[PDB]
Every structure is written in structure tokens, then in C-alpha cells.
């Protein structure tokens, strides 16, 4: 499963990442920068862990900065895997 | 041969469009491109009907996650365009 | 000989310009350049008449899908067309 | 060991925060990260009380030079967070 | 020679029209383009001071007709420390 | 350390050149952070830095926008 939390600002993103790893059995892949101050944090793991991680990351981050998106894909297509 | 693009503001929305597109239709995901200002384009190739179906599915899934800026299909792209694709 | 440029906000509009340019005239696609903030410049080259044709089609195609920031044609020595490019 | 962050718009504002942080308490400067759009994050590491003290001092100092966007402390961060630090 | 000339535009199209006008107008070397965000691009040339002044005025005037010129400047003999950026 | 931060690169290069020309400083940083912001950084004795940054800022204002001018002793 794939979990993403997207924030305005890097400080909110670091807090999401920490909360995600604190809250569930997930691997933190990293983050991506896309401009306009937006930062996407990415984690992988089984679907229940990714759901628990993204819900915890999004809730933590909101108190540090603005949360722009939160999403989980339980079983990404292989073509997606290839570009992640 | 057709080319389909969904451009979102936000990378979470683009990834959700990419996955919806490949899931929805017989299309190959070519890749994504970032150009700044939060803008991310995801590109698919396939027969024309498959790419219209993919891009409409991608755009609809993206809108539930984030913002869609642009959706377009070029049904018969010139061979030179392949040079600039991800 | 000339360079022709169409600069858009958005990559979808830039790819639609690119394909429309090479569809409309005997020009070669050089590629495209990103400067951040969603701004992309698609560059073609060829004979001056063909580049003028191409950039008129490309800007129109891009304005149908998105925003065009600039469209311009620069005549160049036929022995060193690309020397000024980034 | 605790991590402290001050995010500013503008680099001068950030370097001022860094100087203020390291002077104010027993903290190690981890580094700066840039995310574009003029935003820079300065990070320090130390014991939690030292980190709260530094970050306070850094933000106050930065506000006199530029704009402060975020100030935060994580008291007991996981090792994994390193993957994403400068 | 060693004078430095700079023309800064909003937009890459105006920068490349500046470079064409610059190299056409005088004996100068195009060093490159620098992107710094907010859509700003700087075009940098080197040459003797007379070539660089001519090149820079020609670039600024040519860019002004395609887009917006943000800065235009010539440094006849830059310090050695500056050569390092 | 002395810093001059500008909106525009041309103004930045002019500050750097004016600073090093005006005082006993060495150019030790040149950073881009986006949104057009460029910082040039010098090192020397406090007084040479205070006069460098003064001179850089003044020279850069004739060329473009200056956003910050700052001196950190130590």
C-alpha cells in the first residue's frame, strides 16, 4: 500500500513523517518537492498500517502547517510502482 | 499511439490520476513531469478510445484528492513529440 | 533559418503547442525548457517561413488548451542556429 | 535527541536564526533545506529543553530580518526522519 | 577581455531574444542563462568593455519588445572573487 | 559575516562586486532559494563587513531590489 501526506512547508512535512513512523509499521520512502512550497511525504507498508500512518501524519501536520492532501492507494498498479 | 495528459496542482492528486488511468483502461503510463508552482503532469499512451476513457477516469479520481488544472488527448501525435515525453 | 518559441504556463498547453508546430510545418522540435513557476518554453527550428507557420499554429493550439505567455520567432544564421540556446 | 525547525521566507532570516540558535543553547546545527519559493528550513538537534530555547531565540531573531513561516520541535524523533533531513 | 554584461528578463523567450541581439551586436561570448525563480532569467555575456556595453544595450532594447526587462548592467573589470560565481 | 539579499541576480552580482571592491572582505557565499531571491555573503573583520554591506546594498539598489542587508558578528 502507498500513503501520501502533502503539506505547505517542509516543517509540517517533517512532523507528518515522524508521526507516521511513530503511529504504525510503515517505511518512510522520502519526500518530493513540487513548488509553491508544497512537499509530499511518502510511506509504504500494509494497508491497515498505511491508513493508520496517514491519518496520524495528517492530524499532526495540521498543527504545524496547512495539509493539502492525504491519500492512500491500497494496491497501486505496477506501472505506477515503476514511476514512484 | 494516442497521448493523454492530466495536469494537477499537487503530486498526491497526480499519483491518484496515474493509478486511476492505468486501472481504468488499456493504457501505458509514460511518466510524470514537474514544472514548478505545484504543477504535475501525468502522461499515458494507448489507442484513442482507451486514452479518452483513461483521462476522463484520471481527472475524476484526481478531483476527489486535489485540484485538476488540465486534461487533454492528442489522438494522433507526431513522432517528434515522443522526444519530449517522460 | 529561424528559432521559434512558444512559452506557456502548464505543460499540457506546451505539449499541445509542440505537436501542433510539427504537424503544421516542416520544422524540427528542439525540445522544451523549464524555468520554474509552471513556465515552459517549446523551441522549434527550420526555414523562416516554416517557423512562422509553425509558431502561429502552436500558439493557437496552446491558447485552445491553456495560457500562452509569449510567442516569438528569431531569425538565425543557417550555420549556427542553436548557438544562443541554453 | 530532539529536533528543532525554524522555517523562513528569505535566506538572510534563516542564517540569523541559525546564529541565534547555536548561540542561545547547547544545540548542534543539522543544516538548511530549501524547498523553492524563497522558503528555507533551519534544523538543530539537542536535548529537548535546549532545543525549545534555541528555536524560540531563532524565530524571534528571524522575524526582525524576514518572515517566519513555521517553528516546531519534535522531542523524540525516530531515526527514520534522517532520511529527509539536509 | 573581461567585462561582464547582464540582461535579466521575466520569461525565457525575452532572454533568448536578448542573447541573439547581444551576440549579433558585438564581439561578445555568451556565458549562459541563470534561472532564479519568479520566472526571472539572466543572460550573461563576456567581452571587452566596448563590446559588452554595446551588446547589453542591444539585448535590453531587443528583450523589451518581446517581454519585460528587469535589470541591465555592465561591470568593466569584475573582482576575482566574483569570477568564482 | 555580512549578507546582502536581492530580488534578481544582476543586483546580487553588483552587490558582491561592490562589497569586495569597497573593503577588506572575501566573498564566501552565493545562494539561490527561489522566488527570485539571491544572497551574497562575505567574511572579514566586523568593520570591513559593516562597510562592505553598506557599499553592496547601495550599489545593488541602483540596479535592482534589495530585500535584506545584515551583519552577524561572530
Residue numbers in the entry:
A (entry chain F): 5 to 88
B (entry chain D), C (entry chain E), D (entry chain B): 4 to 89
E (entry chain A): 3 to 87
F (entry chain C): 6 to 79
Excerpt from the publication:
The 1,2-propanediol-utilizing microcompartment is assembled from seven different types of shell proteins, one of which is PduA. It is one of the more abundant components of the shell and intriguingly can form nanotubule-like structures when expressed on its own in the cytoplasm of Escherichia coli. The majority of shell proteins consist of a single BMC domain (Pfam 00936) in each subunit and assemble into hexamers. PduA has been shown to interact with the majority of the other shell proteins and, thus, could potentially act as a scaffold for the assembly of the microcompartment.
Overexpression of K26D or V51D mutant PduAs resulted in no higher order structures being observed by TEM in the bacterial cytoplasm despite the proteins being produced in quantities suitable for crystallization and structure determination (see results below). The lysine 26 mutant is the most important to study structurally because Lys-26 is conserved in all shell proteins and contributes significantly to the interface between 2-fold related hexamers in the native crystals. Two crystal forms were obtained for this mutant using commercially available screens. There is clear electron density for residues 4–89 in nine copies of the PduA subunit across the two crystal forms, and the C-terminal residues, including the additional 23 residues, are not seen in the electron density maps. In both crystal forms, the regularity of the tiling is lost in that the K26D PduA hexamer no longer has strict 6-fold symmetry, and the separation between hexamers is greater than in native PduA sheets (67.2 Å). In the first form, strips of hexamers are formed, and in the second, sheets with rather poor hexamer-hexamer interactions are seen. It is perhaps not surprising then that no structures are seen for the K26D mutant in the bacterial cytoplasm when PduA K26D is overexpressed. For one of these mutants (K26D), crystals were obtained, and these crystals reveal more fragile hexamer-hexamer tiling than in native PduA in one crystal form (type II) and only one-dimensional tiling in the other (type I). The mutation K26D has a profound influence on the conformation of the neighboring Arg-79, such that this region of the protein no longer adopts a single conformation in the crystal, resulting in breaking of the 6-fold symmetry axis of the hexamer. This results in the imperfect tiling of PduA molecules seen in the crystals and apparent lack of tiling at all in the bacterial cytoplasm.
